[PDB]
Paper text:
[name] from the filamentous cyanobacterium Anabaena variabilis has attracted our interest because it exhibits robust activity against the RNA and DNA strands of an RNA/DNA heteroduplex. As most other enzymes [name] such properties, [name] is a Type II [name] [name] predicted to belong to the PD-(D/E)XK superfamily. The enzyme is specific for DNA [name] the G↓GWCC sequence (where W stands for an A or T base of a ‘weak’ base pair) and cleaves it to products [name] three nucleotide long 5′-overhangs. The core of the [name] protomer adopts the same conformation in all three structures, and consists of the characteristic αββββ motif of the PD-(D/E)XK endonucleases.
A ‘closed’ conformation is observed in the [name] of [name] [name] [name] [name] [name]. In the closed [name], the DNA is bound to the enzyme by a set of base specific as well as backbone interactions. Moreover, the catalytic sites are optimally positioned in the close vicinity of the [name] [name] phosphoester bonds. We therefore interpret this [name] as specific. In contrast, [name] was [name] [name], due to either trace amounts of Mg2+ ions in the crystallization mix (resulting from reagent impurities), or the presence of Ca2+ ions and the long time for crystallization (9 months). In the specific [name] of [name] [name] [name], the attacking water molecule (hydroxide ion) is either [name] or fully incorporated into the reaction product. To our surprise, instead of an amino acid in this region, we found density for a central octahedrally coordinated atom [name] six solvent molecule ligands. Ligand locations and distances of around 2.2 Å suggested that the ion should be interpreted as Ca2+. Irrespective of the physiological identity of the metal ion, it is likely responsible for the preference for W over S in the central position. In summary, we conclude that there is strong evidence that [name] binds [name] in the A-like conformation.
Residue numbers in the entry:
A (entry chain A): 4 to 238
B (entry chain B): 4 to 231
DNA sequence: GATGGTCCTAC
DNA sequence: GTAG
DNA sequence: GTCCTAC
């Protein structure tokens, strides 16, 4: 499925996007070359284009794009009226509170999405210097990170924010694969799962406090962006 | 993978649980006899038990249990404080509104779960009298309903509350299967998707008004139970 | 559409 | 952990 | 069982 010189196309492609990412990107392509069914479809196009020169070039920009800081807007989705009916008549939330409930529920959903995005980026910043590769841009199906281990065996990892982040359908994506999973938070007990992160260097450099600091650094940058934008429109 | 006498064992098993569901249960066991890889594995037991007499008997109780009314408590999960940090610092929710935000978020997630449950039950009420079977108790992997179409072909359907209920990983459960999917609500546009429900009997008989009447009735009933 | 992110219920 |  | 983002 992958072209005979995929590695060379990839190195060339990423040298024209971000040379600092070229070693990492070429390794992801090598993973995919050996494991072609692990290659996710490009969002628009058909499966048959996977492994071509076009796919490799397109992937290089996606790989870089996935590392760009994201500042999403609040959700502007259309609320499901039936949720408010259940809140009111089953959970006895006063009618007067339903509008604020909808807004804060919606904003909380946005926040959760942001937490999962930041979780991946924090982990990548810490473990990539120890040889792990962040598979950014959605190239490797069901995988966030890969590592070539001591015995020249590929390791694959999926990271989730919580012990209940999946359901029976989404979790099945790993069936018949060696992809491991780790999660950050517990839904039904207090604490964090950071010292169970795979690999010793992971455990020693990652922590809940380190993640919170990463999140604060990001929020400070958004406050700076807001201040600058505010001044441009109001001076 | 299913025993030759699957249908007979099914009838007898469901006769000990609820004779009013024996016809429907037997039809599901017939469906799984023709599509044995569609069968979900049982919780206590190994995969190779699927299609045996003990599996059919256990599935009878599960099938009935799946139809029991649920009355979940409010969620009592431990909140992720990072959500409140983002809510306050990113989305500008004032500090003194964070505790209410956390409670209403939790209750809304609970409410959404209930809506999906009632959505399934409403469809089941309306469509089982038109030959469809509500595959209650999760015997058929990734499937909520089955039906034998006009062309004498088994069809299977997954129902979801919303066009964004799935993600790439959960959606992939149907890859390499003929299982169809339908959703109720649109996330980014106004209205509903009810008249896209598969089969003419679905489209003619299911609606948002119908579903609202069903939900109101369901909730007035359990208010009357709490009154009593 | 597809590719990702997210939380809760019962067993 | 696993069926939703 | 559930909702949101980006292409
Ligand atoms: Ca990912
Ligand atoms: Ca992940
Ligand atoms: Ca179901
Ligand atoms: Ca369903
Ligand atoms: Ca949610």
């Amino acid at each position: 499925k992958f072209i005979q010189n995929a590695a060379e196309i990839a190195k060339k492609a990423m040298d024209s996007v971000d040379p600092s990412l070229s070693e990492k990107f070429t390794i992801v392509i090598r993973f995919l070359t050996d494991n072609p069914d692990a290659a996710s479809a490009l969002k628009g196009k058909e499966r048959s284009i996977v492994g071509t020169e076009e796919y490799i070039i397109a992937s290089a920009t996606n790989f870089k794009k996935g590392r760009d800081p994201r500042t999403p807007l609040p959700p502007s989705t259309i609320p499901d009226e039936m949720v408010s009916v259940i809140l009111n008549k089953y959970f006895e939330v006063p009618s007067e509170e339903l509008e604020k409930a909808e807004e804060w529920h919606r904003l909380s959903m946005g926040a959760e999405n942001i937490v999962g995005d930041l979780l991946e980026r924090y982990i990548a910043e810490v473990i990539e210097p120890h040889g792990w590769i962040w598979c950014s841009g959605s190239m490797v199906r069901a995988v966030d990170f890969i590592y070539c281990d001591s015995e020249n065996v590929w390791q694959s990892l999926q990271v989730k924010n919580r012990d209940n982040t999946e359901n029976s359908s989404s979790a099945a994506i790993r069936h018949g694969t060696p992809i491991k999973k780790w999660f950050r938070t517990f839904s039904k007990k207090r604490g964090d799962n950071w010292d169970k992160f795979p690999s010793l260097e992971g455990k020693e450099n990652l922590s809940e406090k380190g993640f919170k600091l990463y999140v604060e650094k990001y929020l400070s940058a958004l406050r700076a962006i807001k201040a600058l934008e505010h001044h441009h429109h109001h001076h």
